[PDB]
Design an enzyme around this catalytic site. Structure first.
Site, PDB file in Angstrom:
ATOM      1  N   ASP A  48       0.805  -1.211   0.000  1.00  0.00           N
ATOM      2  CA  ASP A  48       0.000   0.000   0.000  1.00  0.00           C
ATOM      3  C   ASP A  48       0.845   1.271   0.000  1.00  0.00           C
ATOM      4  O   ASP A  48       0.309   2.377   0.038  1.00  0.00           O
ATOM      5  CB  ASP A  48      -0.998  -0.006   1.160  1.00  0.00           C
ATOM      6  CG  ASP A  48      -0.321   0.052   2.522  1.00  0.00           C
ATOM      7  OD1 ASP A  48       0.929   0.132   2.591  1.00  0.00           O
ATOM      8  OD2 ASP A  48      -1.039   0.054   3.546  1.00  0.00           O
ATOM      9  N   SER A  50       3.051   2.111   2.361  1.00  0.00           N
ATOM     10  CA  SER A  50       3.659   2.275   3.670  1.00  0.00           C
ATOM     11  C   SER A  50       4.967   1.489   3.753  1.00  0.00           C
ATOM     12  O   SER A  50       5.273   0.712   2.855  1.00  0.00           O
ATOM     13  CB  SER A  50       2.689   1.837   4.763  1.00  0.00           C
ATOM     14  OG  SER A  50       2.403   0.447   4.694  1.00  0.00           O
ATOM     15  N   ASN A  59       4.983  -0.205  11.263  1.00  0.00           N
ATOM     16  CA  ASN A  59       4.381   0.260  10.008  1.00  0.00           C
ATOM     17  C   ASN A  59       4.047   1.761  10.030  1.00  0.00           C
ATOM     18  O   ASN A  59       3.311   2.199  10.923  1.00  0.00           O
ATOM     19  CB  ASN A  59       3.104  -0.576   9.759  1.00  0.00           C
ATOM     20  CG  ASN A  59       2.557  -0.446   8.347  1.00  0.00           C
ATOM     21  OD1 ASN A  59       2.938   0.434   7.598  1.00  0.00           O
ATOM     22  ND2 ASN A  59       1.638  -1.336   7.992  1.00  0.00           N
TER      23      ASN A  59
END
Ligand code: DCJ
Ligand code: DCJ
Ligand code: DCJ
Ligand code: CL
Ligand code: CL
Ligand code: CL
Ligand code: CL
Ligand code: CL
Ligand code: CL
Ligand code: CL
Ligand code: CL
Ligand code: EU3
Ligand code: NA
Ligand code: NA
Length: 129
Positions: A48, A50, A59
């Site tokens: 995504d 991240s 994260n």
């Protein structure tokens, strides 16, 4: 910094991670081995956009700011780079928030898949703690 196994166990214990939210020290050592190979400088990009940072691969989607995860949170109120330091204090303090958020250590995929339900005490065997 790449920690030795007992070195990391001692640092985690000193920082109060042993038995935190009921997770024995071996759980944390096992998680760190499979998340980062005990390397504080570990980083990995997620699908995504991240990124996961440090010994416990925290994260940027939720926990730290890296300036390039648009729409994310910073629930530990830290720059993600703080999670790469040779001093594990920031990673430990953030991990305490993570494991407290309801899902326990299942938040760490490598823990769920490789540590959960195993003889985690083996990870601290021989250490002087
Ligand atoms: C000697 N230093 C480098 C510094 C002083 O403690 C610590 C250390 C110990 N390391 C280590 C390395 C390894 C290994 O590479 O397998 N294993 C262990 C172990 O206990 O099983 C420990 N890696 N770094
Ligand atoms: C002797 N074998 C086991 C097989 C081939 O010679 C290789 C080997 C593995 N070694 C080793 C040594 C150590 C250690 O001393 O900490 N740790 C590991 C590890 O995976 O954590 C592995 N040292 N030698
Ligand atoms: C015995 N298992 C199940 C092996 C799983 O990979 C867990 C385990 C691995 N351990 C281990 C053992 C040793 C060692 O004895 O050298 N070293 C390390 C290391 O990271 O350097 C890690 N201790 N317990
Ligand atoms: Cl436990
Ligand atoms: Cl344990
Ligand atoms: Cl961001
Ligand atoms: Cl970038
Ligand atoms: Cl920040
Ligand atoms: Cl430290
Ligand atoms: Cl739990
Ligand atoms: Cl477990
Ligand atoms: Eu070894
Ligand atoms: Na990122
Ligand atoms: Na973020």
């Amino acid at each position: 910094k790449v920690f030795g196994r007992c070195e990391l166990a001692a640092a985690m214990k000193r920082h109060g991670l042993d038995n935190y939210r009921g997770y024995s020290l071996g759980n944390w050592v096992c998680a760190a081995k499979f998340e980062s190979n005990f390397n504080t400088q570990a980083t990995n990009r997620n699908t995504d956009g991240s990124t996961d940072y440090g010994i416990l691969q925290i994260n940027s989607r939720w926990w730290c700011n890296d300036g390039r995860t648009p729409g994310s949170r910073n629930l530990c109120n830290i720059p993600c780079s703080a999670l790469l330091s040779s001093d594990i204090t920031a990673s430990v303090n953030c991990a305490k928030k993570i494991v407290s958020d309801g899902n326990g250590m299942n938040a760490w995929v490598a823990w769920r898949n490789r540590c959960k339900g195993t003889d985690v005490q083996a990870w601290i065997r021989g250490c002087r703690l």
